[PDB]
Design a protein around this ligand. Structure first.
Ligand SMILES: Cc1cc2nc3c(=O)[nH]c(=O)nc-3n(C[C@H](O)[C@H](O)[C@H](O)COP(=O)(O)OP(=O)(O)OC[C@H]3O[C@@H](n4cnc5c(N)ncnc54)[C@H](O)[C@@H]3O)c2cc1C
Length: 441
């Protein structure tokens, strides 16, 4: 029998990343007086995927939606997220409604975007057919490439980019100010395992040995969640790569209020951040896994997350071939920063927010699956809903606990992503001299 939930209930959130801070904030705002958040790092965490100078936000509605319940759930998440990016003062300053370009460069990719993304959407786009159509979405001198074989779609409003790092900091700040307790650092906040009494989770044991007891334990640790609970293959830690190119104080002025340019098989980039003038590029691919035997001594293989402020040279290559099609004049610029970035993919890349059906006091909130950052303002809300057993019908069944969809899971399934070798890649098959070497020299 799980304890009756009230505002006095001591709550623990494991993980103060994108989803953790969002939850801490929402719990605070609802009247919960006893919320403690645990993280092995101070905000922003160096391993939190939400720690990026920028991420893409997009919201689309559907024609129908009875035709695709997975996607109808996503609109529900994003309709909420967009509204909050525009009205909630904690999040508002860090949304940049600059627009979103989705595109490809081969017949089958372009037809894919037409069929899966554009046709089903109630959104009205501007069809980009030529190299001038791409170049003229941005000020003179920003896009200067030939865009070979490229065809795309511009989405003006209800899409843009977000300063995820700062918004995560802003939410942390407001949660902390409304009275949430943040235990962020090692060993105090580094949770090494959960705590069981009578088949349920009574709290969290951290690396310092203390058992933090709670009536409800919320687990939101991103890629790290896999090594804290048996998720039954429902979470694939996968990594993606990014790198920063620093701009000059003179040239950087032209790269302002730029719409997100995404080619689903080459990558995307976002406008230079206001602080360091750094321009960010991700080479799009199905992702990097780090295949090792699981930490629990099996012959089962797993993707184990590690941290690195470098990227494989093969990713720098893919980034620069992207640069070359779009902004050739920046193609041979030296990188100023790079790192690998860890998320968790579910078998269908819908979120995982549910009470564990064997430990009712545990609430997992994980599996952002590449689309979790934009949800920042409001994800904590649906998480609070789930906790408060009122997760609305439009999403409940889609994001529920579902280990049967991960039976016989192919860890190398491309999960609707394209680019590079068009296969899942493995960090183990990348040499130690085959990474970038940023600084110095
Ligand atoms: C390269 C890249 C680009 C992306 N671009 C976008 C985008 O444009 N738009 C979008 O919506 N999404 C995007 N995503 C997904 C995005 O990163 C989301 O932020 C991700 O889904 C975040 O979910 P999260 O809060 O659960 O994880 P995180 O933000 O990573 O938070 C995890 C936190 O849990 C902590 N933690 C870890 N381990 C332990 C432990 N043992 N005990 C306690 N605590 C712990 C971590 O330190 C961290 O603070 C992108 C992802 C990547 C990798």
């Amino acid at each position: 029998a799980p304890s009756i939930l009230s505002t006095e209930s001591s709550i623990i959130v494991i993980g103060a990343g994108t989803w953790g801070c969002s939850t801490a904030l929402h719990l605070a705002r609802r009247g919960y007086k006893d919320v403690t958040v645990l993280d092995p790092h101070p905000v922003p965490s160096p391993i939190a995927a939400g720690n990026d100078i920028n991420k893409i936000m997009e919201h689309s509605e559907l024609k129908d939606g009875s035709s695709d319940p997975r996607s109808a759930a996503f609109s529900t998440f994003t309709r909420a997220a967009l509204k909050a990016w525009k009205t909630d003062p904690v999040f508002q300053p860090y949304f940049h409604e600059t627009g979103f370009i989705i595109s490809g460069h081969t017949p089958a990719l372009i037809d894919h975007i037409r069929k899966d993304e554009v046709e089903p959407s109630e959104t009205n786009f501007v069809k980009l057919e030529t190299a001038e159509d791409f170049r003229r979405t941005m000020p003179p001198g920003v896009l200067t490439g030939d865009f070979p074989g490229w065809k795309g779609w511009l989405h003006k409003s209800g899409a843009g980019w977000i300063h995820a790092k700062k918004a995560m900091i802003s939410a942390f700040n407001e949660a902390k100010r409304l009275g949430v307790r943040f235990v962020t650092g090692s060993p105090e906040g580094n949770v090494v395992s959960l705590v069981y009494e009578d088949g349920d989770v009574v709290g969290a044991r951290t690396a310092d040995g203390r058992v933090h007891k709670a009536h409800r334990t919320i687990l939101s640790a991103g890629a790290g969640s896999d090594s804290l609970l048996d998720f039954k293959k429902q979470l694939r830690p996968t990594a993606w790569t990014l790198c920063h190119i620093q701009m000059g104080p003179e040239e950087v002025k032209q790269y302002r209020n730029l719409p997100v340019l995404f080619n689903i098989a080459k990558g995307f980039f976002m406008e230079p951040d206001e602080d360091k003038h750094e321009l960010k590029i991700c080479d799009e691919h199905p992702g990097y896994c780090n295949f090792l035997p699981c930490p629990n001594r099996p012959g089962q293989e797993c993707s184990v997350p590690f941290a690195k402020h470098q990227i494989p040279l093969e990713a720098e290559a893919r980034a620069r071939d992207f640069l070359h099609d779009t902004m050739p004049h920046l193609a041979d610029r030296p990188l100023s920063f790079a790192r690998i970035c860890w998320d968790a993919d579910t078998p269908d890349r819908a979120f995982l927010i549910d009470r564990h059906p064997e430990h009712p006091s545990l609430l997992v909130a994980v599996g952002g699956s590449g689309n979790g950052a934009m949800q920042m303002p409001t994800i904590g809300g649906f998480i609070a809903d789930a906790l408060e057993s009122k997760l609305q019908k439009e999403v409940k069944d889609i994001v529920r606990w579902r280990p049967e969809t991960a039976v016989d899971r192919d860890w190398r399934a491309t999960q609707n992503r394209f680019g590079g070798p068009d296969r899942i890649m493995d960090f183990q098959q990348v040499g130690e001299d085959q990474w970038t070497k940023i600084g110095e020299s």
